[PDB]
Amino acid sequence: GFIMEFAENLVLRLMENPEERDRKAREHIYEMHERCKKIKEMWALPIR
Amino acid sequence: MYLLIVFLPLLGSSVAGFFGRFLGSEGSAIMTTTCVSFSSILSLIAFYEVALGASACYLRIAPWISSEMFDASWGFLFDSLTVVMLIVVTFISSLVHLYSISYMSEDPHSPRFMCYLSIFTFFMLMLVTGDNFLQLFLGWEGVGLASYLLIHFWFTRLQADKAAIKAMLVNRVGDFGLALGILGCFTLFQTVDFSTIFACASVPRNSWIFCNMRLNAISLICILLFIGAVGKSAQIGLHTWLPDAMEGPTPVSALIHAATMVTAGVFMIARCSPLFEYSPTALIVITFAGAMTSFLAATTGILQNDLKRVIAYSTCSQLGYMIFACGISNYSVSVFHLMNHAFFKALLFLSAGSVIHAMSDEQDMRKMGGLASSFPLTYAMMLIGSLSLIGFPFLTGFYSKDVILELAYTKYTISGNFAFWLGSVSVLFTSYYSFRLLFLTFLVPTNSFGRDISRCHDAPIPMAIPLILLALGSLFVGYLAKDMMIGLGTNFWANSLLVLPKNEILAESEFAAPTIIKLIPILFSTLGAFVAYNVNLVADQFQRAFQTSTFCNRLYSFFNKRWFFDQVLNDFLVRSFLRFGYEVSFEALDKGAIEILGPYGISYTFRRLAERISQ
Amino acid sequence: GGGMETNKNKFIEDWGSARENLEHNFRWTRRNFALIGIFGIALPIIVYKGIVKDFHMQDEDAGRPHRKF
Amino acid sequence: GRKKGLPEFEESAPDGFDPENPYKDPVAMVEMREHIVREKWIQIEKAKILREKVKWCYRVEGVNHYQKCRHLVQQYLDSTRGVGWGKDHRPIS
Amino acid sequence: YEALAWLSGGLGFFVGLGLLAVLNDKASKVPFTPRVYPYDNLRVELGGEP
Amino acid sequence: YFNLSGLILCPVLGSIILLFIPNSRIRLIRLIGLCASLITFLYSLVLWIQFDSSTAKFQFVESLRWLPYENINFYLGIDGISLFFVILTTFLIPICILVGWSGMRSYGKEYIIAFLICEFLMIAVFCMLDLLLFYVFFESVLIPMFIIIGVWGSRQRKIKAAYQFFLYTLLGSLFMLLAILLILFQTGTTDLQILLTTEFSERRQIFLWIAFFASFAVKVPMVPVHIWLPEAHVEAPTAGSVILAGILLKFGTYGFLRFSIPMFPEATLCFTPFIYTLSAIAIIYTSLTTLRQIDLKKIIAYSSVAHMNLVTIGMFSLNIQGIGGSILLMLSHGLVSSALFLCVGVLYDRHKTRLVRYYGGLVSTMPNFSTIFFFFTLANMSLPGTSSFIGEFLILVGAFQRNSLVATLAALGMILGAAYSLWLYNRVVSGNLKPDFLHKFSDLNGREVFIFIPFLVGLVWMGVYPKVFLDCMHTSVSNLVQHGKFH
Amino acid sequence: FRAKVWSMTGGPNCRPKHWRRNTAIAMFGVFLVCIPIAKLSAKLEQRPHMPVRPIPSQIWCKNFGTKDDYEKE
Amino acid sequence: RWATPGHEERPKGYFMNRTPPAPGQSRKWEDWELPCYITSFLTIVILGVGLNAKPDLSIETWAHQKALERLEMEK
C-alpha cells in the first residue's frame, strides 16, 4: 500500500456525516427553544 | 533556474551559519562567495535572456495570505526593470564578498560576516524580484534588519550598538509611511498585487476621510509611499542614521551605505511608476524633498574630516538627485544614475577601505597626509572613481549628471526650476569636497606618525580584482548604456517603466538645450577644483583657520554638527518621550494615580472601616 | 569564586526595589494634577472626538445620516 | 463518514425565514445567516477569478493595456462595490 | 536651546529660496508650446472609450 | 470516534493517578505527568485531522444534564475558533512540565497537580457553548493560578501579587454573573445556539454589553485596569508565569469573540469608538511605560499588554479579515510571549537577578541562547516572515478599512515596538561583558534547547504559510461577522 | 575561556584540520539539494511572451507561448 | 595560509554543554527524552500524512467551483 490509501480512508471515516450533524443541531435548537417557554411559564407561577 | 537566482544565497548563508564550526574561516569565505558568484552568473544569464531577448518572466510559488480577495503569493516579477537591479545587486555583492575575505582574514569572527552578507543578498533579491506590496515589504524590512546586524557586527563596540539601535528606530519611522501605503492602496483596489493595479491605476478619482480632513486618495497613497522611501533613502525627513552608520566594518559599508540599500527607496518609486504619475501633487513634494536633501548633504560633507563620513554625505546627495529624478516623471535618468552610482561609489568605498586598513586602521583627514607615490594602484582606482563622481566630460558619471540637470532645467514647474537651481549650486559643493578629499590626502606633506609609514603593506591581490572589475565597468558602462536605455523611446522597458504622455519632456531636453546651461556644471566643477586647490595646497595661511571673534566658529559648528539635527531632534522628541514615559504614563496614569485601587489604595481603607465595626 | 548567582550590590538593590513601589510618592502634588488632567482625561477625550468626527465625515460622504453612538 | 467529493448543502433559498419578522423562526434564521455568507463567498471568489483575468491580461498585452482591458477593468471596479465585508458600503443583499 | 534658533534659519533658507522660484515664474518662460498628440491626445490608448 | 469527552478525561486521569503516588517516587511522578500531557496534546492534534472545516454549525458536541428540567446543561463543542486555542493550550502545558523538570524534587507532585488541573480546566473553557458554565470554568482557573503564584513564587513579595490578580478578576466575574442572571431570567436558557437567536432590547443591549465588558476588559489589559498583570506576573514561577501570558490572557479577548460580538450586534456598533479610543491610547501609553523599565520580566509583560491592546482593535473592527487576523495574532502571541518568558526565565534559574543592569555581553558566551533570544525578539519585533506580522497586518487592514485614524495609532504601536524590545536585546546579550557580577555561567543544555524547537518550527510554519490556520476557520469567521443583519 | 563555549557558528578563529574535506562536502551538499529547486521550478516560470531571439531555456521549460488567451483562466 | 592544516583537534565547546563520556559507551539518554522524542515523531507524522490527507473541503474551493460554473452563465 501507500500513505494515501492508509490516510484518506481513515480521515473520511473520521469526518462523521456532516449533514446529520446539521440536522441534529436543528432539532436540538427547536426542542430546547420549546422547553424554554415551558420553563418561563414554570417561573410565571405565583407563590400562592 | 529563476529560483536559483534567489535561493542560492539564502542556502549558502544558512549552511555557513549552521556549520560555521565545520568550515574554517576560509571555508565559508570560499563557499558563500562562490555561491553568490554563481547567483551573479545566473543574473547575467537572465539579463541576456530578458533585457535583450525582451520577454519578461513571471511565476507564483504558493499563496502566502490566502484570505478573502487578499491574495498574497510568493511569486516573483522577473521584469526588465527588475533584472537590471539583479545585475546591480549580484555583481556588487559578489565583488564585495571577494573584497571582504582579504579584510576579514584578521578579524576573528569571519564566517558570521559572510553569513550576514548572504542574508542581505537574499533579502534584497527577494525585494527586487517581488511583485506584491506585502511580499516586497518582507524584503523592505529584511534590508533594515541586515543593515542593523551588519552595523552591529561589533557587539563590544558601544558606539556601534547605539548607532544600530537609532538606525532601526529611524528606519522604522521612515517605512511607517510605506507600511501604511500597502493597505492604503488596498482599500481602493481590494488587491495588493502589482499587475492588477498597474492595469487600472488611473480609474479611481475619489477622496477619503483621514484623521483631520478629507483629502485626495491616490495622492495620499503616493505621499505615504514616498514617506516610506524616506527612511530607506536618507531624505530630509529622517537622515539621522546614514551619517552615523559607518561605525561597523568596511566591506559591508561598500554594499549597504553606497551601493544597494541606497537603491531601495528610489526603486520603490521606480517599480510603482504607473502610480505616482497619476498623483501630480506627490511628485512636486517629492521633488522638493529630493532637492533639499541633495543640497543639504552636498553642503554637509565639505567640513567633515573622515574618509567614510564625507562620502556618506556624497551618497545622500546622490540620493537627493535620484529622488528628484523620480520626482519629475523622468525615471530614466534615475535608474541610469543608480546603475552608475553602484559602480563609482562602491569603487570609491573599496578604495577607501583599502587605504584605511593598510595604514594601521586610520580614517582621518586632519592627521593623515600624503602617501600617493607609496602605492599607485588603488589611488589610480580612486582617482577614476572621483572623476566619475564629478562627472568629467565624456565619462560614466557625466552621462547621468548632465542629463539629469538638463531635465531639471527643462521642466518649468515650480519645483523644476527651484530644484534645478539647487542641483546647479550643489554641483559646486560636490566638486569641492571630492577634490578636497583628493587633496587633503595623497597630495600634501605627510602629517601621520613615523611608525605607521614603516608598517606599510599595499592592497592584496584578491581584494584588488574587485577594484579592477569596477574600474573596467565605470569607464565603459556609461557610454554603453547612454544610447540603449535613454535613447528617446527605447523598446526594452515595455511595461516595466511607464511614462504618461503629458509629462514626457525628453526630446526637448536635448534639442532645445541653450548650450549655455548644458555645459555649465563643468564650469562649477573647474571652479571648485581651483578654489579647493588654492585653499588646501597654497593659500592656507588665512583661508584655512579662522580665529575671528564670533559668527565664524559657530559657522564651523553649524555644518560640523549637521544643522544640530542630532541635537534638536533628540532633545525635543526622544528625550521628551523618554522623560514622559516615566513621569507621565508611570506617574499619573497607572502607577500612583489609579493605583489608589490596588495596594495601599484600598487596603488601608478597610483597615479603618472594618476596625470600627466590632465595637 | 564558585557562586553562580550575582553579588547583589547594595546600591542596586534599592534602585531596583524602589521604582517597584511609587504609590507613596505619587499621592498628592501640583504637577500630578496637571499631568493627569492633561494626559488621562484630555488626550482620550480629544482622540475619541477625532474618531467620532471621522465616523461622521465617513457617513456624510456616503450620505447616510450619522448614528447617535 | 462523507463522500470523497465536495459537499453541497443547499442553493435555492431557506423557506422558513421571513424578512418582515426576522426573529420569528429561530430554526430557519441560522439557515438564512449561513446562506448569506455561502452566497457572498461566491461573489468574492468570482471577483478573485476576474482579478486573475485582469492580471493575466496586463501580463500578456503589453504597452497597449489601456485599450485592450477596459472591458474587464469595468468588470472589476464594479465588482468591488459590494464584495465581502471590507468597506462601509455594504452590499444590498 | 540656541540650536533651535539656527534650525529656523537653516530651513528658512530652503523655503526662502523655494519662494524665490515663485517670484520669477519660469512656467510662462517656456520657449516652446505644449505637446500635442493625434487622436484627441491619444484618447483611445490612454483610456476613455473606443 | 475521538470525541471531546476523552480530551477532558485524560488530564483528569493523569491528576487522579498522581494523587495516590508517594512523594519518594520522584522518578515516576514526572514521567507519568509528562506522558499524560503528551497524550492530551496528541488527542488534541487528532481533532484537527477530523475537523471538517465546512459546516457553519458546531463540531462534536457532548450534552450532560445539569438542572432537573434540562434548562441549562453541559454542552461541549468547537466551531472554528476555539479549536486552535484548545490545540495551543494542550501544547503549552507539556512545555510547562519540561521547563520545571530539573527542580521537581523541591516542587513535589503538587506542582503537576495544579498544572494538569488548570490544563483540563482551560480545555473545558474554550469548548463550552453553554453561557453560564462558560463562566463557571472561566473563573475556575482562579484557584490553580492562585496556588501556582503563591506556593512556588520566586520572591517573598508574592503575597501582595496574588491578591490583585484574584480580586480584580472576582469583581468583573460577578459583574458578568449579574448580566448572565439577567439574560437567563429574560430568555429562559443559556444555550448559545438559542440565545444568539433572541430579539433583545436596545436599551438592554447597552447595559449587558457594559456588564460583559466589566470583566472582559480585565482579562485583556485595558487602560483603566492593567496594573494586575505586571505585578502579579513578574512574581510567578517561570513554568507558571508562562501561561498567565499563554492561555490565561486569551480568555477575555476570545470571550469577546464568542459571547460579545454575535451576542450583541447592535451594541458593539454603538460602542465601537470607545474600544478604539481605549486600545489606541493603550498601545501608546503602555509602550512608553515599557521603555523606562529595569526588570527583565516586566518588559515582556508590557509588550504582551501592547499586543493584546492591538488585537482588541482588530477584533471589534468587524471584518472577515480583521477577526481572522486577530486569531492569528493571538496564536502567534501565545507562542512568542511564552518563548520570551522561557528565554528570560532560564537566565533567572541560573543567576537569580531579574535586572538588566547585571546582564550584559551574553553573546561572548552561551551563543545558542543569544541566537534563540534574537529570533524570538525579532518575532516580537514584528518582522514579516514570522507569524506575528501576519497577525498585525490583518489587524491594520481591518482597522483602516473602517476608520483611518485608528489604523495610524495602531501602527504607532509596531513603530514603538522597536524601541524597547531591541533595546533590551542589545542591553542584555550584546553589551560589554562584566566579570564583577556574572562570575560564571553555563549555556542551554538539551532540555531548554528542545523546548524552543516546537516554538521555532510553529513560528516559522505559521509565519511563512498561515494558509492552513486561515483555511480551517474561514467559515466560522464569516458566520460570526454576518449576524443579526441581512445585507 | 573561548574553548569552553560552543559557538555554533564557529569559534572566533575556528580552523578545523580537515576544513577542505568539510568544504567539499558542504559544496556537494548545496549542489545536491539545489537540483530539486531547479527541477521543481521547471513546472513554473510562466512567460507568455515569445522572445525575438531564442534563449537557452527551451530545453527544460515549456511554459512560454502557450498561455496566450485570457478568457479561460 | 590556504594550504596549512588547521590548528584544531576538535571544534571548541561542548554541544549542549554535555561532556562526552569515555569512548565505547552510549550517551545514557535521560528519562524525559524518550517519551518526548516519540511524541515529537508522532506529531510530525500526524501533521504530515494527516494534513495532506484531509480532503480540501472549505468555503474557498467550494465557492471556487461554484463561481467557475456560475460566472460562465452570462448569455
Ligand SMILES: CCCCCCCCCCCCCCCCCC(=O)O[C@@H](COC(=O)CCCCCCCCCCCCCCC)COP(=O)(O)OCC[N+](C)(C)C
Ligand atoms: C525577518 C526574520 C527572518 C527570520 C529570522 C532569521 C534571520 C536571521 C536571524 C539570525 C541572524 C544571526 C543572528 C544570530 C545572533 C547574532 C549574535 C550571536 O549571538 O552570534 C552567535 C550566533 O552566530 C550566528 O550568527 C548564527 C546564525 C544562525 C542563523 C542562520 C539562519 C539564517 C537564515 C534563516 C532564514 C530563514 C530561511 C527561510 C526559512 C523558510 C555566535 O556568533 P560568534 O561568531 O560565535 O561570536 C560569539 C563570540 N564567541 C565566539 C566568543 C561566543
Ligand SMILES: CCCCCCCCCCCCCCCCCCCC(=O)O[C@H](COC(=O)CCCCCCCCCCCCCC)COP(=O)(O)OCCN
Ligand atoms: C531543528 C529540527 C526541527 C525539525 C523540524 C523540521 C525541520 C525543518 C524546520 C524548518 C521549518 C519548517 C517548518 C514547516 C514549514 C512548512 C511550510 C508549508 C506548510 C504548509 O502550509 O503545507 C501543509 C503541509 O502539511 C504538513 O505536513 C506540515 C507539517 C509540519 C510539521 C511541523 C510540526 C510542528 C508542530 C508545532 C505545533 C505548534 C502548535 C501551535 C498552534 C499543508 O498545506 P495544505 O493545506 O495546502 O495541504 C495541501 C493539500 N492540497
